[PDB]
Amino acid sequence: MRYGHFDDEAREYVITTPHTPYPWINYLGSEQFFSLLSHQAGGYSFYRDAKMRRLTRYRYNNIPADAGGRYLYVNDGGDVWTPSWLPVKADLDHFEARHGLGYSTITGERNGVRVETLFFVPVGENAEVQKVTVTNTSDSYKSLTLFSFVEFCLWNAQDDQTNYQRNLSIGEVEVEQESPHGSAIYHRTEYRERRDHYAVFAVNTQAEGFDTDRDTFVGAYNSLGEAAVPLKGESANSVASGWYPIGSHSVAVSLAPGESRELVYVLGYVENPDEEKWADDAKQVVNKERAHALLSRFATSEQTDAAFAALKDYWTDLLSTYSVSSNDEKLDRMVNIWNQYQCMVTFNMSRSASFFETGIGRGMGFRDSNQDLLGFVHLIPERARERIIDIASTQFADGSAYHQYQPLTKRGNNDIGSGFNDDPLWLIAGTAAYIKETGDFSILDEPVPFDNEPGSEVPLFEHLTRSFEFTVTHRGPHGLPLIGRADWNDCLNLNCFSTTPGESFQTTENQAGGVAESTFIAAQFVLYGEQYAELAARRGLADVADRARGHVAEMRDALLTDGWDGSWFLRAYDYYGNPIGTDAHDEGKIWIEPQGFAVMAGVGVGEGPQDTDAPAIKALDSVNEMLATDHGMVLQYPAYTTYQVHMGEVSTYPPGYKENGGIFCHNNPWVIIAETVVGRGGRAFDYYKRITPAYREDISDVHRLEPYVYAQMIAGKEAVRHGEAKNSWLTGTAAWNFVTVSQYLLGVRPEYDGLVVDPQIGPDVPSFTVTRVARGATYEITVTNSGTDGSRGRLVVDGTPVEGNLVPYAPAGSTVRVDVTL
Amino acid sequence: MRYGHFDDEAREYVITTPHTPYPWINYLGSEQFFSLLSHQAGGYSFYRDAKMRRLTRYRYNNIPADAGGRYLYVNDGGDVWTPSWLPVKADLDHFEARHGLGYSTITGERNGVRVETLFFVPVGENAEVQKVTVTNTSDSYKSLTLFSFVEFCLWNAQDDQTNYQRNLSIGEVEVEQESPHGSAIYHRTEYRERRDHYAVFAVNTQAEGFDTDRDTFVGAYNSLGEAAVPLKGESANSVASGWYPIGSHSVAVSLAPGESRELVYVLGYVENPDEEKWADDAKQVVNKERAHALLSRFATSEQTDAAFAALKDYWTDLLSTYSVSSNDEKLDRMVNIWNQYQCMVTFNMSRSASFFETGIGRGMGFRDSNQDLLGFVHLIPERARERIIDIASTQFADGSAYHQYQPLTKRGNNDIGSGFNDDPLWLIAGTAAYIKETGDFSILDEPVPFDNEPGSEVPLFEHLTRSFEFTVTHRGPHGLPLIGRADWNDCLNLNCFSTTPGESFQTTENQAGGVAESTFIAAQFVLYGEQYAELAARRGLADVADRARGHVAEMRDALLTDGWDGSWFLRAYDYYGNPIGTDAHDEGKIWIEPQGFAVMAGVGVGEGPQDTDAPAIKALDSVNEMLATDHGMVLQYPAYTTYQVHMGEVSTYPPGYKENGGIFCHNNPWVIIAETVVGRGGRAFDYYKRITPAYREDISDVHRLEPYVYAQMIAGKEAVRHGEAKNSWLTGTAAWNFVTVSQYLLGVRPEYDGLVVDPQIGPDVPSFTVTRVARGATYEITVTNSGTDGSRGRLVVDGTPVEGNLVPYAPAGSTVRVDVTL
């Protein structure tokens, strides 16, 4: 069953009931100020740092979930309800919520009163705006009082939730009932001291009254669903002194039958320079000039409507580089709108805040900065270039990388450190992807320091060299790369040996030395090793490139011998040189990561899909037999049923969840791409559909989470909850799936000298057109597709057949038409 | 107004309504297993470490507060209610909660069904036991279903509330409906990996059904007050797989009019040796032997009643060392019962978990370990001895101390470090108080290392020498002790200079060097400097003692000159040598800490209370005029109205709160003791009553927090919330007030050679008798008290008049009668 539907014309997901299987969220904000917003108005906002500059408070694992947010209590004759349904849960005659790109609307109607709220963060502003339309849909006169409500956070969310011994005495506000354009509340905790910022919550009309103390508005012993003040029907005009500050205004609204009223509410973040903090000589009254200026820009519905229009323009213009038109509307909506939106949100939000990530931790993986780029580089290439330079600037001189990058300070995380040996090669991955997209080889000459040390600058290219050489110089007894703390699988910790609750599996190493090797890093080195060698050669370093290709060849051989178990690739050798991922064991016989990545790297690929003795086909067939389920491919099989002390976190999960038998949507694409490489498009597209939001929409009761974005993890076949997802939105799954569908299924992918056109998607998509803007030109690519395994496209360019699958890049401004037959 | 009353015969506080101004809690547990229990059954339990072994989950800053606890939903013919009132909030015919020593009862009645629950942690057990009595008080038959409920925590409370990305997939249980004594649920998250422990929740009868998945029991979109299963009338028999594990059993109860039913529920913590973890060869089933044994010890009401009796005998015998009988019921209940209970709780709980401390942080102040000991050493002298040795073993060889002690690991906190220059002298304070109580000079000979380094051991006496010498060698330009990061006032940070939100005021030092000095440390050196000298001299080191008395003399001279502002003692000199705590300033003119501590040290004391020229009297008279309020004495005045960057955290608080003008109940005792020293007993007792729970019970609506224990902080006169307290239970206020009333107001205090009997309490307690057991003998001290300023006791010992105020210690076994006239 479904709980809504896509509206492709509006580019919205339309949730038609409050009673979803999980809170379904959207993200607002495209610059520095962001909001999380559920279909029940739940969530919170922050400026840049969700740990240290959170404006509003939100409780994770609340009972019930998501029961705090931006609420508007309607009092109609004594009856109090909320359009968001929650928190009051009064019966509504109509409910609808629409999540769009950077905005959402929530509409609730009860007893002849409809309330529509449009929520959005305007471009150019550090604020969340609410455009509220109240309509009297009855045949009687209505006289309403609306009470707004947001609960403030005391900026540092970690302190807010732990240090009550200090913080229940510091909450401060100022109230401005006669604001120039309405009424305003200012939350100013710690402005007294080291803070140069405050929040404003305001409405564009004169409020009847206000409240700033939560205990007074809500009342003792009450939940938000039973808040005393709206029930009494008049604000208490409470002025907070410590405890819990909030923003609430009451607004009187009288409407004849059929009449409506519009109101605009603003939650703003304001900073003043230090010499302008105070209005008064005695330094007691906050300088409100900047806040009044913001409120003046949203004083009318008209200004607000223009602002909303500019946001839609922003997203429309941004998503104008890749689109597809086919027989399959589920495919098209994913490629055209939702997947690309999700990749932008991962750029904007990193791994900070979702309804599973709590916004306290602030970094993301070095590996994920690079992988995310694969998905967003076609949209924001300038920012991509910068991100590459910023993360490369943190790299150590020996080539090792900080495992964790902090995007806000542009530094590596010192506490976590290094030692995850897959990390360095991902920088080659990111850089090459950037250069293929843009043609900007000049990035390789940029001066980039090591560990952010002034004076240490060398060309970015030399950082790639150091990443490459790190792996060469850190190989084990079989010539495979030493794994270190972990590789892409954060839970494969072969140098941990922990028996103490509390020790980090990723950073604890209770034995030193060993010979643990990873076949994942091996495959990664063949793939990105060849990418590095190509860049070196184009750079004119023939010798360096040939030597690199030498090492790459050696690693290919290592994978196909010591790395090969017979019918699939091994996963690793452990600390003592014993194999992991072999049929000789009862559990963990086959692991997905090496099979996908090695075949993407071309390792063991034969003469075609029917060359079934080819190690790549055997491995992929084994994946199909042992790992594939109706909800995607599980990470390994069988899952471990007892703790494997020599392997770290992996076996700590119950069978079927996360890294112990879970379906990692992030790594399924590696196998999808690998199936395109060997020529089995139908199987590739099947696997893509199994895990992709638009195709799972019809089983939303099973997926549980949002039906419009990828999640990290779907429960595997060994779990009672098989098919249920966790960890929506913030995941590398988005990038890898966009790469998969756009570049490998649909087949349109940038190379250094042209655009490759090599569709491999099987019979279910018999004709389609891709429109791709690349290097300033527009390529219109029409494909007629039989879907036959092993059939590859023959190209006709501007009406003339050509050999091969490469279209040399046209001059900017050109339109190039490519007809493909397969 | 009041919300209850003391029941002195029962040693309970009786809360007669659920509608208190704040959740009022008690602590269960006398050893390693502890519970917080509010008057609405809210709270949680943990074994030893509230951060890493929390059994059950509790939300701080919930809406409403304290919704979450151990609940019993009663379904009577489809009407559901809870006897704790929350969370359902059904109208009750009767409610009452009684908090006792290590136990509480909560009783609720509705529509002819009364439910009484006794909660306690039995001596010898790592468990919380509930004895529930259900009574049919109607004239009609009742058929009930009772649903128990607790929400488990996933052990590490920090991870539980942050790492959802992992931990929503790891929740595991086992269900045992046919347990040997009834029915049990086992919470066993991470038992599959590194944990050797699990929790059990069980009832001593066959349950009709069970639930272990919160979402199933409570239902989507519901709060605990609206839980679906109890409203449905039968358990759903849910078995958790991830998400939120709970323990719930349904028990069917049929009662004729006047009939009652008793049930016993147990929440137990069980650990198995690693070789004994599993019942089965396949290592999938937890070994339940130790759990069955526990449950076997609470299978009947009779066993439970006997355990309850042994707990009362524990507390009754523990509190048998100091008691008073007088005309003043309030004084007696504080001295005899509540103040001493609170001191024991501080020992047991350190500063871990209250309704203000969230149990995540695990250490306490080195200075507080010593100060708490002053209050509890008369009850648990052997544990005090061990504590002194354990904290002394962390001390650095230069005499400096770790600011924070971790009692669970018996180590100093390395992240915080040292540099709080008052810390070292508190060790002398603790040790001397210990020796005076017990006469155990042998402790000075115990081998004690520095910084827990093997081989470094020296006698404990040598540690006191390093503490003493640390101050001598760290004095500023005026001969006063350099303050360092802070002194007792953690918010007086004169070497901080922070303008950046997030920097710790206590540890950040943005300028080095300087000459900042503390007059508080100065007074502390005079007091405990003289105690060290006495110990050195009794130890036979005449030279050391005389030299120590010399430094003490010089410090006294420094305080009365450079440390004297004219009518009171300065507070400090800042980094640049400018005074703090002077009448020359508009703000922060007078600070309480030095006024009290210096006069405790005898500094400035004249020939009597009418010697108005004596600095000690001038200081105290200034305290009375400028700091004393009806709710206690504020820390300084006036409070700072703008941020003083040169002073750290102090001026970040709004005026009237915490260290910026708040009333610290911890430091009021210093002035109270000082007033007895100078001879103004009535003033002393006045001040004690202003801040003491029994005397504030009648303004519970103002104080807000528990009326049977001290809190840290009452809002000062410059706060709009003047009178309202924060930070109940865990505070050194308990210890210092116990010392004050037991040793200085009532006047009975141990010295090395005898018991001093020197009452100074004023006219309001004209006669009283103290029973003190000391060094194995019983002193019965009868006092007839005119209360006149400056009149001190004349003693008659066993019928014979003696000179002076010291009674030589009788041999163990003796009863000595002392009659005192003043």
Q: HEC states along A29-84?
A: CCCCEEEEEECCCEEEEEECCCCCCEEECCCCCCCCCCCCECEEEEEECCEEECCC
Evaluate whether B99 touches B39 at the Cβ level (below 8 Å). yes
Instruction: Tell me the CA distances in angstroms from A242 to A463, B23, B655, B715, one per residue in order.
Output: 52, 18, 11, 11
Residue whose C-alpha is closest to residue A37's, from A29, A50, A27, A46 = A27
User: Alpha-carbon distance A210 to A287, whole Å?
Assistant: 21
Q: Which experimental technique did the depositors report for determining this structure? A: X-ray
Collect all residues of chain A within an 8 Å Cβ-Cβ radius of residue B18.
221
Collect all residues of chain B within an 8 Å Cβ-Cβ radius of residue A242.
654, 657, 721
From A358, A361, A653, residue closest to B169, measured CB to CB: A653
Instruction: Tell me the CA distances in angstroms from A422 to A163, A387, A398, A434, B433, one per residue in order.
Output: 39, 19, 14, 19, 60
Phi-psi region of B61 (alpha: psi -120 to 50; beta: other; left: phi over 0): left
Collect all residues of chain B within an 8 Å Cβ-Cβ radius of residue A61.
59, 161, 164, 244
- List the single best residue of B60, B88, B162, B169 to mutate versus A (max A Cβ within 10 A): B169
Structural domains of chain A in order of their starting residue, each with its CATH number: 1-271+700-710 (2.70.98.40), 272-321 (1.20.890.20), 322-328+746-822 (2.60.420.10), 329-680+711-745 (1.50.10.10)
Tally Cβ neighbours within 10 Å of residue B811: 8
Q: DSSP letter at A745?
A: I
Whether A242 sits inside 8 A of B168 (CB atoms) is no
Q: DSSP letter at A658?
A: T
- Residue B586: exposure state from Cβ atoms within 10 A (0-12, 13-18, ≥19): exposed
Evaluate whether A725 touches B246 at the Cβ level (below 8 Å). no
User: Alpha-carbon distance A513 to A468, whole Å?
Assistant: 22
Whether A19 sits inside 8 A of B165 (CB atoms) is no
Whether B242 sits inside 8 A of A361 (CB atoms) is no
Tokens linked to B393 = 């073993």
- List the single best residue of A71, A95, A165 to mutate versus B (max B Cβ within 10 A): A165
Tokens linked to A176 = 């401005």
User: Alpha-carbon distance B710 to B692, whole Å?
Assistant: 7
DSSP H or E stretch at residue B542 = helix B542-560
Question: Nearest chain B Cα to A500, which residue?
Answer: B194
The structure tokens 């060869």 sit at B281
Residue B56: strand pairing partners? B152
From A18, A162, A192, residue closest to B643, measured CB to CB: A192
Q: Where are the alpha helices (DSSP H) in A361-413?
A: 366-376, 381-392
Q: Min CA distance, B218 vs chain A (Å)?
A: 9
Instruction: Tell me the CA distances in angstroms from B658 to B421, B586, B650, B664, one per residue in order.
Output: 21, 20, 8, 7
Collect all residues of chain A within an 8 Å Cβ-Cβ radius of residue B166.
658
Residue among A66, A211, A328, A490 flagged as catalytic: A490
Whether A223 sits inside 8 A of B224 (CB atoms) is no
A/B interface, count of CB pairs below 8 Å: 177
Tally Cβ neighbours within 10 Å of residue A287: 17
Whether A502 sits inside 8 A of B64 (CB atoms) is no
Evaluate whether B123 touches B30 at the Cβ level (below 8 Å). yes
Question: Nearest chain A Cα to B656, which residue?
Answer: A169
Collect all residues of chain B within an 8 Å Cβ-Cβ radius of residue A498.
194
Evaluate whether A253 touches A134 at the Cβ level (below 8 Å). yes
3-state secondary structure B55-91: EECCCCCCCCCCCCECEEEEEECCEEECCCCCCCCCC
- List the single best residue of A17, A49, A56, A221 to mutate versus B (max B Cβ within 10 A): A221
Q: To one decimal place, what's the resolution in Å?
A: 1.7
Evaluate whether A519 touches A590 at the Cβ level (below 8 Å). no
User: Alpha-carbon distance A353 to A342, whole Å?
Assistant: 14
Q: DSSP letter at A757?
A: E
Q: Min CA distance, A352 vs chain B (Å)?
A: 12
Tally Cβ neighbours within 10 Å of residue A540: 9
Strand order in the sheet with A12-15: A4-7, A12-15, A94-99, A103-110, A113-120, A127-136, A260-271, A197-203, A182-187, A173-179
| % helix, strand, coil for chain A, step of 5 | 30, 25, 45
DSSP H or E stretch at residue B368 = helix B366-376
From A62, A498, A720, residue closest to B241, measured CB to CB: A720
Whether A357 sits inside 8 A of B164 (CB atoms) is yes
- List the single best residue of A46, A193, A500, A660 to mutate versus B (max B Cβ within 10 A): A193
Active site residue B490: yes
Residue whose C-alpha is closest to residue A387's, from A415, A351, A422, A350 = A350
Residue whose C-alpha is closest to residue A631's, from A555, A563, A703, A544 = A703
User: Alpha-carbon distance A600 to A595, whole Å?
Assistant: 9
Residue A458: strand pairing partners? A448
Strand order in the sheet with A404-406: A364-365, A404-406, A411-412
Evaluate whether A103 touches A119 at the Cβ level (below 8 Å). yes
Whether B499 sits inside 8 A of A194 (CB atoms) is yes
Whether B721 sits inside 8 A of A52 (CB atoms) is no
Whether A641 sits inside 8 A of B284 (CB atoms) is yes
Q: Min CA distance, B646 vs chain A (Å)?
A: 12
Whether B501 sits inside 8 A of A67 (CB atoms) is no
User: Alpha-carbon distance A532 to A432, whole Å?
Assistant: 8
Whether B67 sits inside 8 A of A223 (CB atoms) is yes
Residue whose C-alpha is closest to residue B264's, from B214, B302, B228, B229 = B302
Task: List, as one string, the DSSP characters of B179-192.
Answer: ETTEEEEEE-TTTT
Q: Is residue A800 helix, strand or coil?
A: strand
Whether A61 sits inside 8 A of B172 (CB atoms) is no
Residue whose C-alpha is closest to residue B770's, from B761, B783, B760 = B783
Collect all residues of chain B within an 8 Å Cβ-Cβ radius of residue A500.
194
From B161, B223, B358, residue closest to A61, measured CB to CB: B161
Cis peptide before B477 (omega within 30 of 0): no
Whether A658 sits inside 8 A of B169 (CB atoms) is yes
User: Alpha-carbon distance A611 to A678, whole Å?
Assistant: 9
DSSP H or E stretch at residue B303 = helix B301-318
Residue among B66, B328, B372, B490 flagged as catalytic: B490
Question: Nearest chain B Cα to A722, which residue?
Answer: B241
- Residue A323: exposure state from Cβ atoms within 10 A (0-12, 13-18, ≥19): middle
Evaluate whether A565 touches A582 at the Cβ level (below 8 Å). yes
Whether B221 sits inside 8 A of A283 (CB atoms) is no
Question: Nearest chain B Cα to A40, which residue?
Answer: B221
Whether B192 sits inside 8 A of A220 (CB atoms) is no
Q: Min CA distance, A386 vs chain B (Å)?
A: 27
Collect all residues of chain A within an 8 Å Cβ-Cβ radius of residue B90.
none
From B284, B500, B712, residue closest to A194, measured CB to CB: B500
Collect all residues of chain A within an 8 Å Cβ-Cβ radius of residue B658.
166, 169
